[PDB]
Amino acid sequence: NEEFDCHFLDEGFTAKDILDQKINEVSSSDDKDAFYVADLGDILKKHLRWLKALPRVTPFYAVKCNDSKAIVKTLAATGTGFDCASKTEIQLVQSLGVPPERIIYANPCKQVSQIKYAANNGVQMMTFDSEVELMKVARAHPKAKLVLRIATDDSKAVCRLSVKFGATLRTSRLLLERAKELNIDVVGVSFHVGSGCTDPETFVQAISDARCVFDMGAEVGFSMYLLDIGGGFPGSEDVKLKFEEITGVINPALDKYFPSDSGVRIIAEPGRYYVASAFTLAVNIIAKKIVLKEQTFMYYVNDGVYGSFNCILYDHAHVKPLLQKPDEKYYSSSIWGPTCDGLDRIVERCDLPEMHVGDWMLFENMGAYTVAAASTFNGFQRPTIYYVMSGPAWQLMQQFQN
Amino acid sequence: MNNFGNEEFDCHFLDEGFTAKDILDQKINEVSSSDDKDAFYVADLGDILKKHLRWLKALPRVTPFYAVKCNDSKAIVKTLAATGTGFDCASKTEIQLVQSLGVPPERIIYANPCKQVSQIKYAANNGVQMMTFDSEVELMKVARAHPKAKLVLRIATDVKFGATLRTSRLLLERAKELNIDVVGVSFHVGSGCTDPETFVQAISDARCVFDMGAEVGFSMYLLDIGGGFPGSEDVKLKFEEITGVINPALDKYFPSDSGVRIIAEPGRYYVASAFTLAVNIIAKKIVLKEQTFMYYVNDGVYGSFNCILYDHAHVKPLLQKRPKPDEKYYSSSIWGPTCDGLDRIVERCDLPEMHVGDWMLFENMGAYTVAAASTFNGFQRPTIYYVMSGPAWQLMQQFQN
Ligand SMILES: *Cc1c(COP(=O)(O)O)cnc(C)c1O
Ligand SMILES: *Cc1c(COP(=O)(O)O)cnc(C)c1O
């Protein structure tokens, strides 16, 4: 099974080199299905980077971003926690040998049978943001350790009037009093700034708001210790607001509002940060049209918006096709997926040299919210993932296991 | 009602005087005093037979080739195969599904104009000869991978697919140069079509390409009028209004004495109304503005309601029991189960106050729902319970023999 198969990445070779080699090796055949190269060493590099940038914050990987068994196994060996939102995610993480104390069930709105599943498997820490959730916990998981999820503002959200998750400060006070009345233990506060964050000061506001709810907790009689700063950190350098600019703003706020001597335990829920850059997708041009307007091209490829490029609809993705000479002419071009749906278009207009059927197009930074939400609509199967890892990366993972 | 092994090939009897709504009520009543309240579908295979009877009456000159991509349920494909439909397959996996149920390749049209070479080869390897195309590069691929194929030229309608009339002339000349046989013309007006006159113009364009093919020496006989027909009565432009415009155009441009064989590629028409989805309210918030409610249910935009993003769907939540005129309604939103702020299924609707454990129903959920669902965030696909009455089974027997 390719899911637990890992290939060696030789010294002085990058994931890009491996991609080029596989492409060369299938040159004279029609075995040209789309495929990923997934560098597990990149995930270890992200972990070293996290330990350096956020030394007080324990990462809990957001499984939904990419539930690859190889990814979860690599991060588990590294010693991360996991943010699970469903029975299936908890099952996946536990099947790889992760104990329940390394899981946070950070779904604020949980089906009762899934709350019971968590209780049956010893997963004690869950989030909530509503009184109905407290009633369900009192019935189905009364000894749970609850983390209150507070609202964060996103001034760029498409729907700012209706926010799916997060209690206001006023509601937070009423929730803490209600939890006390029901004899439910609230142990902390969580927030999630969201992947659309343009200003790191949003984290400062959320940390300040979390401190306010910690103070409310102390007033109601709770022993709050757990601060969860959520996710939304970028997974590549191809962004305006880079990881270390965010962390450089977070750390002074953590020191100010949650000093280490308070006994607080700080965690986060990064998803895309760990995995986005680790996956590169290669698709093959399977069909081609020339349209005179002067010369323009339509390229059809063997992954699309029902597959990996669902990220265009669900994840606000803007994808950048890359070629697998400076003087050669570029033409206005559109790129289409393989399904028989006129909506299955990946790129409306870009400039490309004339390409041909059998040529490859590459898409970097395809690890997060891609394969996790792909379907087999129209019968088109998911691209094979080839996992690679260098010897030195494997050795680094071994050091973490000890 | 519980499935017996795998849901795929399990079918339950629908007793005399019971409807799919009654079965849905019974299942809801059966789990009432428990927490096993996962979302589920009731799929009435007898509704697919009713659609088939309606098609034979409305379009008696047109052989239906079911568009598998709309809903690739094995139970649906087996029902329609026994009924004697053809199948429109776009990929190796869809061809494999149809052949696995015993359908011979002559009842398959590979109506994907832009096909991966290895998938063209798969079709050739399995005797699927009829394929569509709309480009010169496609002719080059067919010349190499499926040289004895019978090609159907897909034309543009009022743009991912479809050759203009000007391009169609060049493609016919090119096909002749490459010794590839072109046997007909196809078009697809699109599900978004509000004007049935689009079909008249498409049929006139198809006649023009037939005439162009006759000029270059082809024996054109296959007219394929595509899909886009509605699957429920909950539409402005109803099936029989469309067919009432199509039939006079077929008789005018393609009279029966010409030897033409006319087919179509209905997907949603056959299956939309056959599936009703029941979702459970798993979480609830009250928001004071004056009281409004937010309901969370256990299927969402990554599951069955992907139709909101991919299929232009406008979904209508229904209660098990039609409320009293006196009952107070509140402004309400409905959200899916995933930890994604975008997973919202209804922005604003009026509902009585509802509670965790209550069910909401969504009718007409057969087409472009389960076919494109994912298990994002670990949320599993709803169980489908297939039902069929004895009289529906008898009707299927009449079609099968
Ligand atoms: C999805 C999710 C995350 C991960 O988000 P990223 O943008 O991938 O970092 C973190 N926390 C919660 C509660 C989530 O639902
Ligand atoms: C999808 C498709 C159909 C089916 O469309 P419906 O709107 O479901 O009837 C028919 N023909 C072609 C070529 C298609 O791609």
Beta bridge partners of B13: B388
Beta bridge partners of B182: B151
Tokens of A175: 């929730």
Interface probe with B: pick from A164, A269, A343, A380, most Cβ of B within 10 Å: A164
Closest CA to A315 of A373, A385, A375, A382: A373
Q: What DSSP designation does B381 have?
A: P
Distance B277 CA to ligand 1 centre (A): 29
CA of residue A273 relative to chain centroid, distance: 7
CB A188 within 8 A of CB A227: yes
User: Residue A29 is inside which H or E element, if any?
Assistant: none
Contact criterion met (CB < 8 Å) for B284 and A87: no
Q: What DSSP designation does A100 have?
A: G
* Pairing of β A295-301 and β B383-389: unpaired
B191 within ligand 2 shell (Cβ under 6 A): yes
User: Residue A21 is inside which H or E element, if any?
Assistant: helix A15-25
Please give the Cα distance from A160 to A155 (Å, whole number): 7
Sort A318 into a burial class: Cβ within 10 Å, 0-12 / 13-18 / 19+: exposed
User: Residue B65 is inside which H or E element, if any?
Assistant: strand B62-67
Domains of chain B, by residue range, sit at 35-45+271-388, 46-270
Ligand that comes closest to the CA of residue A166: 1
Instruction: Count CB neighbours of B215 within 10 A.
Output: 10
Q: Which amino acid is at A184?
A: I
**A86: phi then psi, degrees, rounded to nearest 5:** -155, 165
The experimental method, as deposited, was X-ray
b/e sequence A362-399, b meaning 16+ C-beta within 10 Å? bbbbbbbbbbbbbbbbbbbeebebbbbbbeebbebbee
CB B230 within 8 A of CB B189: no
Rg (C-alpha) for chain B, rounded Å, is 23
- At how many Å resolution was this determined? 1.7
Degrees, nearest 5: CA angle B3-B8-B12: 45
The Cα of A261 is separated from the nearest Cα of chain B by a number of Å equal to 33
Q: Which residue among B11, B89, B339, B349 is the active-site one?
A: B339
Instruction: Give contacts of B335 with chain A, Cβ < 8 Å.
Output: 109, 164
Measured from the CA of A85, which atom of ligand 1 is nearest?
Answer: 15
Closest CA to A104 of A80, A83, A77: A83
Distance B61 CA to ligand 2 centre (A): 19
Please give the Cα distance from B345 to B394 (Å, whole number): 39
Ligand that comes closest to the CA of residue A272: 1
Measured from the CA of B191, which atom of ligand 2 is nearest?
Answer: 7
| Residues with Cβ within 8 Å of residue B335, at least 6 apart in sequence | A109, A164, B294, B295, B296, B297, B300, B343, B344, B345
Which residue has its alpha carbon closest to ligand 2 atom 7?
Answer: B228
CB A356 within 8 A of CB A285: yes
Please give the Cα distance from A88 to A107 (Å, whole number): 13
The distance in angstroms from the start CA to the end CA of chain B is: 31
Beta bridge partners of B349: B332
CB A90 within 8 A of CB A79: no
Query: How far lies A46's CA from each of A74, A244, A350, B217, in Å?
Result: 12, 12, 31, 64
* Pairing of β A322-323 and β B86-89: unpaired
| Residues with Cβ within 8 Å of residue A108, at least 6 apart in sequence | A127, A128, A129, A130, A133, A149, A165, A166, B283, B339
Please give the Cα distance from B301 to A315 (Å, whole number): 12
Degrees, nearest 5: CA angle A365-A371-A374: 130
Beta bridge partners of B285: B294
User: Residue B138 is inside which H or E element, if any?
Assistant: helix B136-145
Question: Is A340 one of the annotated active-site residues of the chain?
Answer: yes
Contact criterion met (CB < 8 Å) for A287 and B111: no
CB A166 within 8 A of CB A193: no
- Best residue among A43, A50, A64 to mutate for probing ligand 1's pocket (most ligand atoms within 8 Å of CB) is A64
Beta bridge partners of A127: A147
Ligand that comes closest to the CA of residue B366: 2
Helix (H, G, I), strand (E, B) or coil at B241: helix
Query: How far lies A176's CA from each of A119, A128, A221, A257, in Å?
Result: 22, 11, 9, 20
b/e sequence A225-241, b meaning 16+ C-beta within 10 Å? ebbbbbbbbbbbeeeee
Measured from the CA of A108, which atom of ligand 1 is nearest?
Answer: 13
CB B66 within 8 A of CB B270: yes
Query: If you write DSSP's letter for every residue of B69-130 in order, what string do you get?
Result: GG---HHHHHHHHHHT-EEEE-SHHHHHHHHHTT--GGGEEE--SS--HHHHHHHHHTT--E
Contact with chain A for residue B373, Cβ under 8 A: yes
**H-assigned helices in A188-242:** 201-220
